[PDB]
Design a protein around this ligand. Structure first.
Ligand SMILES: [Zn+2]
Ligand SMILES: [Zn+2]
Ligand SMILES: [Zn+2]
Ligand SMILES: [Zn+2]
Lengths: 382, 382
């Protein structure tokens, strides 16, 4: 069975992993190799079978789990494209809802104006038609008395004359559409901004936090620093002891939020958000790395952003001292933007931080020192 | 016929404008009055009739014309409300057209991404299904050779072993949707602005006007000041002789217009509009009351508005020196606004005049002095 020495295969060559005849093995191709008897070779190779079997089983289970992961990835591609479509739909429907509402309201007002013009004009019209037929009647009553016997002419001519005269002097006495010009596009665009914001987050001045000088009122939505001297504050690690400030009890942790506060003519204040990880006791250092994101006003008109530096950044003083501040907070984009919100229609950006906030934050209102009575105005949540 | 003296009426009392008897007139109620005979009274009163008749005719014609004016005013109320509605429709359709187009384009891109994911994933999936069935075939081919007569086991076991081994090591190798976050509203809003503008007015550098140093190129839409020394200009009262400037041949007279000019890195220039009523010869004083509405750049980075004062107003230097200026002109609102237009998506306002321009204006481009070679860059109409 050697096929070359005609003598069957009985020796296994281990360096060539093939069978051989006794001669190839004695003095032939395989004379110097490592060889052993065939029975021992098969009994040595058979022992490797459990491990080859299990390496195959394990490889197949790996690939099966990968197949499972890919099959899941397909439906997650489906769902992701679905949510993308739906999110575009919803963010654009905000704008389309606004335009639709605006157009309908403009149209209602148009119809109102035009109908009122119609009735006013038609009234003056029918009252001239009456006056004009009175004139007609005068004219040919005058021609009735124009040619009649002498004495009856004398008996009524000058009553007719007087009547004519001052029904001539009884003569009758004599729109408001907001017609639109080129900057209307631009006014609608500027008004759309305020609507792009989320519904006003309805927060609450949290008396569990307020500095002992402050009082909350109007259902926890107005904070006022008091005429009177206050007791010292206890060591509750999140009541304010030195900085006269107060937080909302609502903790903001995800998504996007918008809120407005009415400052009016208050000469000094600060507004923004404080991290939950930083404590509120002792003197505070108003820079981001302390968990403080603050916009401030001092001396009635000087507006300072409290960004990570030594000095705060002076800002462009607006036309008027801002009477209401709007605050937009996006965690997804790490953004705290401050807006002049005195115009209830159009928002004007003051400043914005671009920092991914570490974790959850509280809206903080520094209703700053009463300073011997000159800063007694309140903070009002709009 | 007196009804009190029984004796007929024959005398007319002129101060009481009534008839009387001879007795009332002789010694009675009317004894001291002014009286005349009845025949003369009727012959005196009859003469006033033509003028009373014509005063009536003229009063009636006046009221008739007023009736005509009111009747016209009604249909003009109709047409005014119609045009108001249609103008709101059209200015808002601008915005709605934009949003619709944007949503469709986002959707097309979504489908593209998802289909390509589908094919890539399904390819890797069917190629693992093939690899896994190969593993199956390996496994029970291995079990076919696991238990067979000695020598044929030895004759093929280790070819099977090698095959298994490196088809095990032949193992297989291992989306891009622009998924949208909260500031997408805001990006779409900022991109809408550029679309609120009217179609680019397609102007032409008018060589009939250019200062003798300049050359127009690219179909009258690029002006460059030349290396070379120029001839003096003739006394055509609207060619520029001292200020090296050039106008569009298009005269703007009504409505609203928008155009963009590419300045790039040009260190010094001015752009804006010049009145047709002011002449372009000699040295020019760049303030409004001379018919010049100009924004300027000097020393590469300093941006000055040329408003009616002694000094020009310095402006906020943008992040980068602006590479393209956009100009919006509304006569209806008396407005010339300048925009940073380097971002082909979002426009940023530099400055705007708020003055009702007297009459028609030309777009003027001060392609300022070549200044011995350092300001040789061109002005390009976008
Ligand atoms: Zn042999
Ligand atoms: Zn050998
Ligand atoms: Zn009498
Ligand atoms: Zn009398």
């Amino acid at each position: 069975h050697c096929e070359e020495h005609l003598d069957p295969l009985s020796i296994y060559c281990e360096q060539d992993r093939t069978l051989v005849c006794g001669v190839c093995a004695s003095l032939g191709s395989h004379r110097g190799h490592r060889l052993l008897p065939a029975a021992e070779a098969q009994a040595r190779l058979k022992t490797q079978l459990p491990q080859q079997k299990m390496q195959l089983q394990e490889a197949s289970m790996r690939k099966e789990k990968t197949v499972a992961v890919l099959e899941h990835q397909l439906v997650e591609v489906e769902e992701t494209v679905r949510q993308f479509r739906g999110a575009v739909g919803e963010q654009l429907g905000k704008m389309r809802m606004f335009l639709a509402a605006l157009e309908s309201s403009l149209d209602r007002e148009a119809e109102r104006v035009r109908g009122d013009a119609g009735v006013a004009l038609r009234r003056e019209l029918s009252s001239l038609n009456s006056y004009l037929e009175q004139l007609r009647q005068m004219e040919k009553v005058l021609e009735e008395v124009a040619d009649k016997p002498q004495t009856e002419f004398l008996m009524k001519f000058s009553l007719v004359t007087s009547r004519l005269q001052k029904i001539l002097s009884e003569s009758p006495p004599p729109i408001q559409l907001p017609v639109i010009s080129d900057d209307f596009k631009f006014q609608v665009w500027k008004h759309m901004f305020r609507h792009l914001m989320p519904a006003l987050e309805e927060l609450t001045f949290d008396p569990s936090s307020a500095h002992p000088s402050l009082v909350v009122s109007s259902s926890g939505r107005r904070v006022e620093c008091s005429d009177q001297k206050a007791p010292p504050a206890g060591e509750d690690t999140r009541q304010f002891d030195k900085a006269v400030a107060v937080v909302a009890q609502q903790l903001l942790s995800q998504g996007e939020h918008y809120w407005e506060v009415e400052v009016g003519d208050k000469p000094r204040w600060a507004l923004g958000v404080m991290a939950a990880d930083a404590s509120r006791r002792g003197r505070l250092h108003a820079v981001p790395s302390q968990g403080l994101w603050l916009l401030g006003l001092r001396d009635g008109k000087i507006l300072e952003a409290h960004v990570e530096a030594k000095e705060p950044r002076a800002l462009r003083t607006p036309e008027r001292p801002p009477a209401r501040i709007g605050l937009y907070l996006s965690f997804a984009d790490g953004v705290l933007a401050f807006y002049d919100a005195s115009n209830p229609d159009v928002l004007t950006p003051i400043f914005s931080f671009h920092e991914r906030l570490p974790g959850p934050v509280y809206p903080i209102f520094d209703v700053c020192w009463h300073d011997k009575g000159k800063n007694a105005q309140p903070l009002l949540l709009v």
